[PDB]
């Protein structure tokens, strides 16, 4: 119910996705098995819609918050590299309004609230925490994600728990990767947490995203957003400046496509490596041979066919004016 | 439920975020009626319909007669019109406990008239009074201000048909979610080192379950080999992994000399331990002959399998009848 | 079966008074409204009077305009019976009077909707 004021605009940064964005297709266990599966996946090096949520002072400073309406398409890969856990929740649905039911996932400490209700989402949803100066503690006091909820159909609440809310600075160290999918009346949420030391871009390391939760939900998700633990500049430790501000935090986005992937399950059924069939001819040969190593030789991978450029239909001429018009005229 | 909503205010309460066991819930078994027109949780105990809702409401006894599909009249018209084609069952039992009387609590009224019948799935919760045909009214004692909500027979009642029944319809109108929440939780014990048919979360297979040393991941449930065939299953009730193998699966060969010489023969069971041979053929055939070849003093084990009816001898001769694995049988003494 | 019996009526001098009794049995007369109708030679059946039990505090009475201010209708639920008092009768009041009840609550003026009808009694007014 609050509109963001004085928000800067910058070009959207891009970066290669590397091998990140790999999850277990199912719960089956395999030992030292090269399994080829066709499903939604993030192609390797297929760009990333890098977004920034950072406030920097000075003449060259910039106060950028990235919470747009990114289309969900047919699955989304979301990577957050940070340490203060500014990213807290996500918003999905078709209209993202009370007109139609919508999904709402919020990590506001205490519990991870998941709901499927006709939420009245505002223009700029966010999770704003005010710094209570009486005892110098962080708390949530700007829950403007939605004005009201109606026609509730599903709710899930986790056990109590709390984490640090201060916007610690320095090189990001915690990487959280999630894959959101929506297939045949099921919303699949994957997750994985890793420690790192890089400051920007997705690390080249490979790590599979194990299944986290499956939700029975009937909403037809087409568009989604993100929720940041906004730090209200009015109530901050050491200052009470006006406007909207936030600490150091970076996150990435990715779009899944229907691809065939060869996964190498090790002796204890944990994905150690993945190969994309439609990435390069070498990978296509590898996944056609169902092996990660190819020896010298020539292998027929597939066939190609020039698709019809256009459709042409030709029938005899009009000929002499028939009595048909005369009958109707 | 301690408090049951009235028929005119029936609640479309839904159940999820848990897995239920209808068998335990059915301990009372006090339901007066059982009208099931599909794969009911009681009838079928191996499905987990997702969009299943337990409508918490109370109706008068007679209304139990009008809880059939496509029904129309009184309750089926204005109070509670269930879907014309609803998948589920209707449960009704006469309690008369919460009402504190055998006639019916006054708070359990039922809407009527209003000249607007319900749809098979809609609800019209409203306290508005019936409108007259000459002048609108909304209460008091004006012109035709009949209250649509009429209390049940609070006065003494003779027949159970005029008493409040705590009727809940277990209708599941699945639209996009096949099955996520289970009502029934039929289960059995655990058997190991024995050929049996096992059904693990819908995966059906015949084999000999055995303790497995494989370390499945916490999320992992099933297992498979390079051949894409199940070879290990995790117990859904405990963090235990059990292997799966064919029961015995052997073939029977008859090592027999020429009938012109003798009639006694030997039986070879392919790649099976001799201990399982007596159960391999079930020993249920005619008492002589086969039973003698089922087991006996002369039983030998080889890479080929189990041989019964042939006496193993240290002496080695030319291969007369090829059995396999460098082992042959001969009729000579 | 629902049975309605009408008593009273007869021949009365113009300007007199009369009382008609309608006894109803076989259903719940307390709540369902009861309506008195009169049919005259050459006249169809039309609403004349009615009484309803809203169930809150009182019984509402509806009177037709042509007899408004002169015809009174009352109901005794304990006795399951209806009184209809008439004063200052007129020659045109001569007719056969019926009392009707409904299996449910219906509009008072809806004579057809009344599923139960009694035998009725004849009333004649002489100058
Ligand atoms: C699946 O298999 C892998 C590899 O076999 C397991 O890796 C194991 O990881 C643990 C620690 O993460 C290693 O522990 C070490 O074991 C040695 C030998 O017993 C011991 O001397 C050390 O002091 C230390 O405890 C272990 O060696 C290593 N390999 C194994 C167990 O074979 C992995 O843990 C397995 N997955 C699961 C879920 O068990
Ligand atoms: C990096 C990559 O793999 N693909 C494209 C690259 O070809 C293009 O130049 C760049 C600029 O939009 O965006 C990305
Ligand atoms: C600090 C805070 O917001 N805590 C709330 C808690 O009160 C609520 O019960 C739960 C489920 O909605 O979500 C969280
Ligand atoms: C009096 C006061 O300061 N109360 C707040 C409390 O409401 C809040 O939950 C906590 C951290 O969230 O910080 C403190
Ligand atoms: C089938 C069913 O709903 N049963 C319920 C359950 O709470 C229990 O079996 C008993 C009450 O203690 O009867 C009732
Ligand atoms: C192995 C074999 O054939 N043994 C005997 C053969 O020696 C004999 O000539 C024949 C007579 O019918 O019966 C048989
Ligand atoms: C219980 C039993 O018979 N187990 C046998 C084992 O003794 C034998 O070593 C193995 C290979 O022949 O086959 C099995
Ligand atoms: C009849 C006979 O002597 N059979 C022998 C047995 O005694 C011995 O134990 C075995 C292994 O050496 O070879 C065979
Ligand atoms: C913010 O701006 C949008 C843009 O039209 C407007 O619709 C909305 O009412 C404004 N206020 C809020 C609280 O979103
Ligand atoms: C798409 O969405 C519409 C409305 O949101 C819904 O009616 C339809 O079933 C959906 N189709 C799917 C999920 O395939």
What features would you describe in this structure?
This is part of a larger assembly, with 2 copies of chain A and 1 copy of chain C (127 residues). Chain A has 329 residues and is mostly beta strands. Chain A has one domain (13-300): Spike glycoprotein, N-terminal domain (Jelly Rolls, Sandwich), CATH 2.60.120.960. In chain A, 5% of the residues lie in helices and 38% in strands. The longest helix of chain A has 9 residues, at 281-289. With 127 residues, chain C is mainly beta. Chain C has one domain (3-125): Immunoglobulins (Immunoglobulin-like), CATH 2.60.40.10. Chain C has strands at residues 3-7, 10-13, 17-25, 34-39, 46-53, 59-63, 71-76, 81-87, 95-101, 116-117, 121-126. The radius of gyration of chain C is 14 Å and the shape is globular. Bound molecules: a molecule of 3 linked components (NAG-NAG-BMA) and 2-acetamido-2-deoxy-beta-D-glucopyranose (9 copies). A molecule of 3 linked components (NAG-NAG-BMA) binds next to loops of chain A. It is classed as viral protein. Keywords: SARS-CoV-2, Spike protein, broad binding. SARS-CoV-2 Spike protein in complex with a pan-sarbecovirus nanobody 2-67. Chains A, B: Spike glycoprotein.
